[PDB]
Amino acid sequence: NVQSRGLDVAVRNANDGISIAQTAEGAMNETTNILQRMRDLSLQSANGSNSKSERVAIQEEITALNDELNRIAETTSFGGNKLLNGTFSTKSFQIGADNGEAVMLTLK
């Protein structure tokens, strides 16, 4: 009975870990989209047909996207626990019926 109750708790904990990973990866997907837009803007700006004004406009858009990247990094949280700002170091998710059966998850 102790083992079965611990296994129920372990399923709970594994689901919570999957939830955290899902939220973090969705935020990373938005980050990837913003990065691809930035790369397209940089490729467009590298062309010699543009004068300095077009480069300035593209740099303004790239700065806005960069600030959006920082905002996503600093605000993405799981209930108030930040994920992609670097403060979320390795966390051990306990997915066993007995103690000492945890798995480490790192968020960069």
């Binding site: 920082n70 905002r71 990094a73 600093e74 605000t75 108030g80 700002n85 403060t87």
Partner: protein, 108 residues
Amino acid sequence: DDIEEVATYINGQTDMVKASVNEKGQLQIFAGNNKVTGDVAFSGGLAGALNMQAGTAETVDTIDVTSVGGAQQSVAVIDSALKYVDSHRAELGAFQNRFNHAISNLDN
């Protein structure tokens, strides 16, 4: 970084205090009474540049949202109040569990 990015960075780095910006660009810092005991002392170059003022005791009864800074501070006030209410609810639930166990023991 501008003042709002500074507030977002402060929010991401720590959970003891909550930072926001009002309409005049002044940086507001809220320390919940269930997370901080006594006054908070500010030091460093950025603290000297901002020149943080003395502490005012805020409660849910004294919040107003007629200004953007008022709403920003009231959000943190309500968060602290919610944390306090949830803590007392958890205490009551533990009490009820304990009394149910006591009733079972007394019955047997």
